[PDB]
Design a protein around this ligand. Structure first.
Ligand SMILES: [Ca+2]
Ligand SMILES: [Ca+2]
Ligand SMILES: [Ca+2]
Length: 176
């Protein structure tokens, strides 16, 4: 049954590998948050960054548990796809928001100098360009995510666009 899905999820594996161990560990999540905070040209060991990293940590827990390995174990490529698949398909709605909520949230906190808890087009663009996206890409991705066409991207509409690269990538998830 696998065809185009393999390619998309396959690269995502080799696309990360912080240390290049051939697996996914928790320490890989910690560097991520840090590696990101820097992209916004700000602190490192501050609170906003510590918060995000703090959230990213618990995210691994779900993997070790669902995968059945350990908080200090590792997941293979074939494992990622199998477990990832269920995450996108299986799993409860509140399940993705529960474990990922604090992960995506931490990012919104740094991506808001007004403290409103929402992602405005001016905020979204700032992040897309931060990861290596063009100014024209943000404007396009923004409208695609605004499910309610209200002009504001809330945490809800955030995850939706985020996890949706399986079939015909639209936003390209977090990585970019
Ligand atoms: Ca790794
Ligand atoms: Ca805001
Ligand atoms: Ca919207």
């Amino acid at each position: 049954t696998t065809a185009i899905a393999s390619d998309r999820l396959k690269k995502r594996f080799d696309r990360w590998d912080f240390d290049g161990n051939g697996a996914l560990e928790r320490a890989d999540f910690e560097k991520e948050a840090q590696h990101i905070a820097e992209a916004f040209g700000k602190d490192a060991g501050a609170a906003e960054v510590q918060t995000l990293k703090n959230a990213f940590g618990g995210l691994f827990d779900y993997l070790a548990k669902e995968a059945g390995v350990g908080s200090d174990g590792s997941l293979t490529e074939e494992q990622f796809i199998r477990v990832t698949e269920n995450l996108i398909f299986e799993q409860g709605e509140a399940s993705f928001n529960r474990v990922l909520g604090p992960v995506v949230k931490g990012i919104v906190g740094m991506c808001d100098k007004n403290a409103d808890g929402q992602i405005n087009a001016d905020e979204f663009a700032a992040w897309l360009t931060a990861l290596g996206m063009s100014k024209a890409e943000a404007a396009e991705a923004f409208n695609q995510v605004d499910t309610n066409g209200n002009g504001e991207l809330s945490l809800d509409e955030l995850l939706t666009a985020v996890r949706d690269f399986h079939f015909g990538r639209l936003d390209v998830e977090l990585l970019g």
